[PDB]
Symmetry: C2
Subunit: 248 residues, 2 copies
């Protein structure tokens, strides 16, 4: 048998729900995380999406960076599936967590590192382009740390909100050397500039640690895929990590 | 005679007030821009700061990126000094505004270009690290355009506000290749990452237009000058532009 698993990645903005019966093929959906969402509301949203699959679920695993949502997921699991979910957390084992406080690292990044070591080997740099844009370094199966910067949407929104005159710009790479209107100026600074920022952090990493392979993932990674030199593109890295952590 | 001029730079978070008698040396104060401030409230704030000098003011020049503040400045000038202010604007003259809508470029950036062309030459790249971080290009006396990204504080605050878990971090450069705690991750991504962003944008400008001199300016520019290659560091660039535009 190939038991069906529900894997959940709870983000600040969006939550990913995915089912697998093997841990290699994932069907996935995405919902807004919302505020004050309830377990019945969650069930109601998932019902026409999962269809008949809903009744086959045998385990629920979750990585969450939104502690407020966690009792909702717990309640959903118990009411609808009569099980408690398994929660992604940094713990001792095959990944060494070489940072000041491993329990402080977001469950999403933990999950990425778990999936990495499990599928891609012992040495790597993970770029997760999501709500935040995250860089994470794995050396010899030890998590060594990383960098955080605002994600693309976070940046354009910040300029729109933090300013009287700037518009909210659609995230799209610039193909010019300087922008000729406001929208172009922001595409160039936020999109192309964040790509330069990443290329720069990776560069300094590689000077100290070698020539590690780079995996790209995240909700916002598809738009700039080509622009960053990478060995692996894997949109399912986080959900793979939940799967491996919880269900091995 | 050496008439005293008040120069004003109205920004989204702060407004700079400076006095000069020569346009070569400036005394400056900074205040929050606030919301719903009145001309009497402005006078009240400036009164103990400007002191005796307030009586000597013969002209007021203003660059503003906050249109709702402008009527307040107009009324302040007329009530307390019986003059209308002079407003910095892109217009034909010593600078050619070679972009789609010159009237849409921020008055702060207009003033930076005016000061640069008047003070430093016909060819250059201006980096202004403030609310936003701006890049502007001038080639043979022609403003060619630029880039806009969130400023340092805007970035750290966007992470704090847009996230359940991330702290609000103090801006300070990273002296390390990867961060080992949340605060370090953010410093590396926002501060060092923004430096990389700027270097990559400038690099690409340089490839096309040659080795242009770079000026650094702005209220968040101190901490990072030792990280960017620049030929001119001038914290008074915008106020100088205001002076040159309005008072010659």
């Amino acid at each position: 048998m190939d038991p069906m698993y529900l894997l959940v990645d709870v983000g600040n903005t969006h939550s990913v729900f995915s089912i697998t019966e093997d841990g290699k093929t994932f069907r996935r959906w995405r919902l807004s995380t919302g505020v004050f969402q309830t377990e019945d509301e969650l069930f109601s949203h998932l019902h026409p999406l999962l269809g008949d699959a809903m009744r086959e679920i045998k385990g629920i695993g979750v990585a969450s960076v939104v502690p407020t949502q966690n009792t909702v997921i717990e309640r959903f699991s118990q009411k609808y599936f009569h099980i408690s979910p398994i929660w992604v957390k940094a713990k001792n084992g095959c990944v060494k967590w070489n940072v000041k406080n491993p329990s402080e690292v977001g469950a999403d990044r933990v999950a990425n590192v778990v999936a990495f070591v499990k599928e891609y080997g012992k040495n790597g740099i993970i770029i997760d382009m999501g709500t935040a844009t995250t860089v994470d370094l794995v050396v010899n199966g030890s998590y060594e740390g990383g960098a955080i910067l605002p994600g693309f949407f976070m940046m354009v929104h910040s300029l729109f909100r933090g300013t009287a005159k700037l518009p909210l710009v659609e995230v799209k790479p610039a193909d010019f050397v300087v922008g000729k209107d406001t929208e172009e100026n922001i595409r160039l600074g936020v999109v192309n500039g964040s790509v330069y920022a990443l290329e720069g952090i990776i560069g300094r990493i590689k000077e100290v640690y070698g020539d590690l392979p780079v995996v790209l993932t995240g909700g916002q990674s598809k738009i700039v895929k080509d622009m960053i030199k990478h060995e692996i593109f894997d949109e399912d890295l986080t959900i793979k990590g939940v799967y491996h952590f919880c269900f091995g």
